[PDB]
Structures are given as structure tokens and as C-alpha cells.
Amino acid sequence: IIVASYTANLAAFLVLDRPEERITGINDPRLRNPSDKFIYATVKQSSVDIYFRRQVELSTMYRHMEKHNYESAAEAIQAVRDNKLHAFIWDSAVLEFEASQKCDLVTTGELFFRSGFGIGMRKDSPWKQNVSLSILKSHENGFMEDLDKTWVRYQETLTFENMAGVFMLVAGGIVAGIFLIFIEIAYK
Amino acid sequence: KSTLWLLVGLSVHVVAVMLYLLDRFSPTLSSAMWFSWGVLLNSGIGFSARILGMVWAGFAMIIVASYTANLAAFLVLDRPEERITGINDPRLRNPSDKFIYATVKQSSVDIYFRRQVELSTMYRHMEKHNYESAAEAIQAVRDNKLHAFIWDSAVLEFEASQKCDLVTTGELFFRSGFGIGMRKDSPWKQNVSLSILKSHENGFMEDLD
Amino acid sequence: NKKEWNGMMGELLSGQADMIVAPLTINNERAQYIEFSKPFKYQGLTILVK
Amino acid sequence: NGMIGEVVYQRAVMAVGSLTINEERSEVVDFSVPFVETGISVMVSASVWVMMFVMLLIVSAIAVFVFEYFSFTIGKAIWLLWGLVFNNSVPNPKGTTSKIMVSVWAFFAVIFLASYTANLAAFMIQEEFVDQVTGLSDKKFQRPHDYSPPFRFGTVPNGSTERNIRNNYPYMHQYMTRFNQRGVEDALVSLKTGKLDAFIYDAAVLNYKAGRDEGCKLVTIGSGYIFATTGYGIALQKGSPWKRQIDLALLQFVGDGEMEELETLWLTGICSSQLDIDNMAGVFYMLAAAMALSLITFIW
Amino acid sequence: ERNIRNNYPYMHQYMTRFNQRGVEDALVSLKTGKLDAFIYDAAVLNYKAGRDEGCKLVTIGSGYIFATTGYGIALQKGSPWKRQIDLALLQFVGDGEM
Amino acid sequence: SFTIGKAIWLLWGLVFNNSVPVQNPKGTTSKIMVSVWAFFAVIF
Amino acid sequence: GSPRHTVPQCCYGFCIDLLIKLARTMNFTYEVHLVADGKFGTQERVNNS
Lengths: 188, 209, 50, 300, 98, 44, 49
Ligand SMILES: *[C@@H]1O[C@H](CO)[C@@H](O[C@@H]2O[C@H](CO)[C@@H](O)[C@H](O)[C@H]2NC(C)=O)[C@H](O)[C@H]1NC(C)=O
Ligand SMILES: *[C@@H]1O[C@H](CO)[C@@H](O[C@@H]2O[C@H](CO)[C@@H](O)[C@H](O)[C@H]2NC(C)=O)[C@H](O)[C@H]1NC(C)=O
Ligand SMILES: *[C@@H]1O[C@H](CO)[C@@H](O[C@@H]2O[C@H](CO)[C@@H](O)[C@H](O)[C@H]2NC(C)=O)[C@H](O)[C@H]1NC(C)=O
Ligand SMILES: *[C@@H]1O[C@H](CO)[C@@H](O)[C@H](O)[C@H]1NC(C)=O
Ligand SMILES: *[C@@H]1O[C@H](CO)[C@@H](O)[C@H](O)[C@H]1NC(C)=O
Ligand SMILES: *[C@@H]1O[C@H](CO)[C@@H](O)[C@H](O)[C@H]1NC(C)=O
Hints:
7 chains; A: 188 residues; mainly alpha; two-stranded parallel ribbon; 9 helices; 9% strand; D: 300 residues; 3-stranded antiparallel β-sheet; two-stranded antiparallel ribbon; binds a molecule of 2 linked components (NAG-NAG); binds 2-acetamido-2-deoxy-beta-D-glucopyranose; transport protein; Ligand-gated Ion Channel; NMDA Receptor; ionotropic Glutamate Receptors; membrane protein
């Protein structure tokens, strides 16, 4: 019953107890009313700021991030890489590309506000009709996916948990056993 | 609210046959035979065949460890999925005759679902099986002639205390109240609610509990 | 109290820029002000953690 | 013909109903901003052992050393040692240092097999999502004679997806000419009853029927990665003054998540068995290695 | 306090030693350890435990052995708005908008 | 000679994967019944 | 399908004792009967009127 309890609490200690290293989306109640422990923000003076300024029900997040919203995106990425921040709101494939760069960058599960990127334009101007038609012409063939192959699509047990200290203790027990061999020499 | 083990049995009989053949080929009979009878379960046993014995004993312990693994997968991953989990059950959102559920005929839940047009379909599933009294639904669900019933939580948990073969789900909705049915303007209108409030302020409602 | 723009829209409406070819976010207020093309990229919001 | 014939010949102003947007439809009439991401898809159905070997040699060598201190278990300590690893009732140590060292080794083996049960429980945690075909770039998507079963695919008749095929691969249109069908739910039945192997359609109805399938036995490919990647919209006649207002209304419907709320209202986010045949295949491979070692020892 | 004075007079006199000032004051008194329990309304403490930092402070059950009351809208004896407000609250119950 | 009526001793002394010396059994029916009980003790 | 013939019986329980507390509390007496047909009652067009 001792070794059964040992199996049970090791399965309790290193198997099922997976900590919430991520947030699993915006519906985290610890982030609905956050504190100084969860410093999440986005790009200062960005479209995310406009989209959250529209949200009349999440003004708490707007008041929380506005003390910490940063100028450029990559400097915020480096700051949360140095763990000055705790989370970052951004669009999907950019963060997927950065996770494909380095494997220390983790997305979330909740995928919301599926917005779109297009071409910024003027008012009524003849550089809009055939240009957007050419965009749609490039959608049908795989040139979109060719550009995905250039940048988007191109990405870039072991048991060392508690047996390492046991390994070191048995390695010291080898020296202690040699000392007990000297004790057995002292017996004669 | 086994066969792979038989394949392992055929394999270990092949192991026993080749243990006997290679123990003959190791320059005794019943020794190696009953040894092969005693290895496979780590039974009490008081050198080239010993190599097959040691490697197959490694196989046998990883086999029984895999048996521990798939029994743990059989009893941990098989949480009881018979829970409907409230109104948001997709088998009830698009219902069939596989889950027979209804409500009391001429009940307030009928008008409550008739106003909620977005729950028309379940309504159209429940309009064809409505029962006169609730005990009809009780006797039908106890004898598995139904699959669900919509009712107040306190009475259902009371009857689950009465009948331990009944299961309540997790969700809760339509947080309403039961009071006393009243007429129009009457001299026995205010003092009744005053006496109910007198029962709520003291422990008389606690006595009713 | 006169509202104006800045950045890429600011250089656009001043005549310093003529067409924004960029990962530019499509929203409601800019469509009240400028025109858009049909979108090439479709992606949603997500949370980067460590 | 159809809704396009109603709009172009102006018996209908617009079409609120769902429709794919492509090139020549945008040439003849106008479109609004998109509101849903609808592309296309295809509905289908060691070192630890090394270091413990080194420490096992260390334990066997120190057992030989205790034998040299102070009647036939000199090299036989390896067999009995590795048997007490597995606790087999092997057919008795005498040296005190040897008993303590073999006991610490056996306790190490017990906690290592307990960590192996932890490995098995972590294997119990892992739920898989297997994917047979992972995109339009499959080599199955060139010829059904290239692989041993000649499969069947298809699309909806007279659809815009057929026009995308004809502008991508008319040879694929010729293979689909022998593999046509009529009804969407009939194509669902033909997938269920084995009359059809794969189906090609936009992600909208396929994800919608994925949220209502009885059993979820038919899964598409991914979530729109290497696919057509377009959207749905509202077709309008050229010169409509309503167009800008409809675009701003759609953007406001996106900007509060009310579009997302209607998506959640009109979608459904849904979707014992022992299995060891990979590890059983490793068992068969290692017993083949064991009989190969017996074949090595058969030189005498 | 008045309901306790109707119910538990001697325990009201024990709680006379145990008075305090604020909701967050009693919150901090329960977080530190200078207070063992607290009595208040139900769903207020349900919401405040639903937003608790780590779900530290726990209620007792789900409101079973308690006073069994609710919240309402007070009007004067004779205002004609009473029936309209009552029917409107019943309509807000009847659609599930509540 | 000593596990005659002491089958409880070797039996309950080998339920728990004990590695404690008890007796080498000669009865083959006893060995099969020991294997059945030990298989049941493993699954237990 | 049978004629009604409502008979006096024994009735008790929760709201029975609640009404007994009411009649003991406020200065009135009572008279217990039951509905002829055990329905809550929904509003519906009868075949005439
Ligand atoms: C309701 O209950 C009260 C109980 O007090 C009844 O008696 C009246 O009580 C008040 C003081 O509470 C006295 O001032 C009145 O004189 C009492 N009424 C009479 C007729 O003497 C009261 O009659 C009951 N009826 C209602 C609805 O008021
Ligand atoms: C797809 O296009 C063909 C064009 O040939 C159409 O076929 C029609 O199908 C109906 C089915 O009853 C026939 O009555 C018509 O005579 C066919 N017309 C022509 C011109 O062939 C139809 O639009 C589509 N086919 C189907 C069956 O859906
Ligand atoms: C209801 O009370 C009556 C006795 O007063 C009994 O039932 C009667 O039985 C006949 C049989 O055909 C029918 O006319 C009616 O069912 C009843 N008629 C009368 C006179 O009421 C019986 O004791 C009671 N029924 C039940 C079901 O308990
Ligand atoms: C747009 O395309 C048409 C195609 O015929 C062409 O005639 C027209 O000049 C183009 N307008 C421009 C240059 O934007
Ligand atoms: C009820 O009222 C009458 C006067 O109408 C009075 O005489 C009698 O004492 C009262 N009874 C109770 C129960 O108080
Ligand atoms: C009485 O009303 C119901 C409901 O409208 C109807 O179905 C039934 O036919 C009516 N009875 C007769 C005799 O028509």
C-alpha cells in the first residue's frame, strides 16, 4: 500500500497537474478584472485599441492596457520575451509566424474577431476597380499560396523530472559504497 | 442512469516451445518445460535459454504494464457521458425520437416555450407527447418510457431522495418563484403576503425546510 | 477640439501618400472616411504568451 | 441564370442569401465587404536505457569487486540483477555492500517502472486528431490509379467551385466528369455508404454539418490553410447607392461581435478502446531481434 | 442586523463586539485572519467569490439553510406604476432577458 | 515439509510482489492455482 | 370517462401546513377542496364562443 500510494501521488505530482501556463483566451476571469500580476497589453495607437474602445463592456481592459500599451510590436514581443509583460493581443498568422520562428512563443485557444487585411485606398479614384479585380484574380490561383510558401507556410519519454536527483544520490551512494568497502577492509 | 491477450497467449506458447528447443540446443526436459510454465507470470521458480527467458521476462513486465495502462485508460477516460448537461445538449437542439422527452399537458412550461419561438423545435418535439399529470411522467421515466423532464430543482431533488434511480443535471434556468394564487382586490390580499414575510424573517421557513 | 488623423492615414490624406499597400486593418471608421479594396488576408485575434 | 440572371436583368435588386464571390461575378455586378471566412476543404472520413546500462555495468563490476573481496555468481550477477529489475522469481547475495547496492538498484528500477506508469498515464492523456490527407497538394489528388484504391471525389453540380476547378485544372474537371453527383445530402449518404470517398466544398456547410453529424465520422482537412481562402458577401447591382451603407452596417455588425453572436447561434462547436499495436509492433521487432541474437549464438 | 435582532438577540450582542465598517473592510479582515466568517446577502457574495483572486474565500453550500428572500423595487402605497413595473419584470423573466 | 498446512503463509506472503523467500512448490496443481491467484493479485 | 363524484379524503403536506399556519395566524377559517382536473390551466380557444 506504500508503493501504491507512491504510484498514486507521482501520478498526482507530474502527470495530470498541468498548470495554466497560458490564459486560454479573453474569457479568463482573472483577466476580466486583472491586477499587477497579469500585465497584458497591445500596440499603442493601433486598431486593436480602436476595437476595444468600441467595446463598452470591456472598458476595464481598456483602462488596464492603456498604462502599458507599447509603440512598436516587436519591442513588445521582446519585452514579454524578457517577461516585462504577460500577454499580447495580436492577429493570428503574425504570431503563428513568430512561433514558427522561435518555439518560446505560445498562442491561445479562443479565436475571435476574424478581421481582414486589404489595400488602403483613397476616395473615388481609377486605381481601385482593376486593382481589386486583380487581387481577386490572384486569389483563385495558387500565387496566394506561393506567397504563403515564401513566408507563411515555411516553418523554421525523456525522463529528467525527478530521477535526476535520484541519479545524483545513487552516484553519491557509489562513493559511500566504496567507503563501506574500506569499512569492510577495516573489518579484517 | 482479451483478444490481444489471447494473441499474447499464443505468443508465449511459441516462446515456451522455442525455450524448450533452444534449451535442448544449449550444450532438463521437465525442468525447462515447467520453467516455461513458471516464467510468464513471474511465478515462483526456485545458459543460452536463460537469454530468451530474461528478454521475454522484460516483455512480460512491459505487457502487464501495458495492461495497467489500458485498464487505467478504460476507467479514467470513460467518464459517464450519459449526462445531458442541460438545455444546450446538441442531441436535443436537433432532437429525434431517440430521446423521448416532454412536459405536462396544459402547463406553464408550454406557454413559456410557446413564447420562446427560438425553442419552437423542442416545443414541436414535446407537443406530441404531453402528459396529464406529473406522476405519469414519473412512472414513465422510472420504467424508461421517457428520457428527460423539465421541472423545478427542489421537487426533483426531493424525489431523487425518494427514488435513488433518478439523476439531475448541472444547468439551471428560469429562476422563478412559487407564491400563493390570489384573486383581484380583496381584504385578504395584503395580510397574506405580510404573513409570508413574517414566515421568511423568522425560522418558520427554516422549520418548513 | 478638431479631430484629425496621423500615421499612414495622415500621410495619405495630406497627399504625401496615395495608396497603403500594407497589412492594414479593416474597420468601420476608416470606411466612413476612405475606401477599401477587397481583403486579401483573413485572420482573427489571439494572445501571445510565454 | 439564377440569382445572377435576376440581378443582372434587374428583376431582383440584391441577394441576401449566401453565395460565393469570384471574378466574373465581380465583373458583372458589385459585392459588399465579406463577413465569413469561407475557403474550401475536402470532406473525408533511448539514452536513458544507455545510461542505465552503464550504471548496470557499474553495479555488476562492484559486485565482482565484492566477490574479489570475498559461489558462481561472478558474471551471473547481471542475469539475476536484470531479473530482479523485473521481479521474476529468478532461480541470493551474500556481500553486505552488494546487497545494499543491488537493493538501491532495485529500488531505482521500481521507481523507474513507476515513472514508466507515469509515461503510460501521460499516454492516456493524449487524445489524437488523425489526418489522412493534409491539403490540396496531396499526391492522391493527381490520379486515383496512382494509389491502389481508385477513389471517388466530386462537387455540387453547376457550382462556382466547378468553375474554380476548370480555371485551375480542366483535367481535374475531366476526372470529376466521370465522378459527378447531384445532391448535397445525397453526397453525404454516398460518403457514409461508401459510394463516395471524398467531397470538395466550401468550409461553411461542411463545418455546419460537422456540428450536427451523428458520430462525427466525416472530418474535412484542417481549417482552411492551403485552400481557396475567400469569403461570402452580398451581391449588389452596379451603381447602387445602398452599397456604402450596407458596408458600414456589416462593419458595425462585426465590430460588436453580433456577427460572431449570430455565428454562435447558427453553429455548434462539437467534435475504452485499448490500442497498443505500435508498441506491440515494437514487441514483435524486439523478439525478432532476440531470435536474431539466438541465430548469432547458433555458431556453436 | 434587524433580522438578527428578531432572530438571535444574544448572538447580536456577541456580534456587537464584532462590528466593522465596509464590504472590502470585511473582505480584508477575512483575507488576513482577523475575522472567521461574515453574514451578508447571497448573490453579492456569490459574485464576489466568483471574482475572487484564486477562489480563496468560499461560501457555505449554495444558499440552502438561509432566509430565502429577494430584491425588489420600492414604490409608495398608491402609485399607479406598481402594476406596470410588476408586469414588466414578469416580461423580463418570461423572455429570459433577466 | 513445512508448508503443509501453511498455504495461507505462502499465499498471503506472495500477494503483494514481496520478493521474500517462502518455499519452492512441487505440486503442479498448487503452482497453477498460485499462478491464478497471483494474476488476480496483479490485477487487484 | 367516468362520472365525477368528488369524495372527501385525507390531504396533508407542505402548503397544507402553511395554510394552517395562515389560519392560525390571521383571524379566518378555511375550506379545503381540490381541482376537478389536475391541470395548471393554459389559455386556449374552446370549441364555441
Ligand atoms: C390586516 O391585518 C391587521 C392586523 O393588525 C388587521 O387589523 C388592523 O390592524 C391595525 C394595526 O395593525 C389597526 O390599526 C386596525 O384598526 C385593524 N383593523 C381593524 C378593522 O380594526 C386588518 O384589519 C387586516 N386587514 C387589512 C387588509 O388591513
Ligand atoms: C446543371 O446544368 C445543366 C445544363 O445542361 C442543367 O440540366 C437541366 O436539368 C434538368 C433536370 O430535370 C432538366 O430538366 C433540364 O432539361 C436540363 N437543362 C439542360 C439545359 O440541360 C441544370 O441546370 C443542372 N443539372 C441538374 C440536373 O441539376
Ligand atoms: C370513485 O368512487 C366510486 C364510489 O362512489 C367508485 O367508482 C365508481 O365505479 C363505477 C364503475 O363503472 C363508475 O360509475 C365510476 O368509476 C364510479 N361511480 C361513482 C358512483 O362514483 C370508486 O370507489 C372510486 N373510483 C376510484 C378509481 O377510486
Ligand atoms: C480597367 O480595365 C479595363 C479593361 O478593359 C480597361 O479598359 C480600363 O482602361 C482599365 N482602367 C484602368 C487603367 O484603371
Ligand atoms: C376574530 O375577530 C372577532 C371579531 O370579528 C373577534 O371577536 C375574535 O376574538 C377574533 N378571533 C381571533 C382568533 O382573534
Ligand atoms: C375543437 O377545437 C380543436 C382545436 O381547434 C379542433 O382540433 C377540433 O376539431 C374542434 N372540434 C370539432 C368538433 O371540430
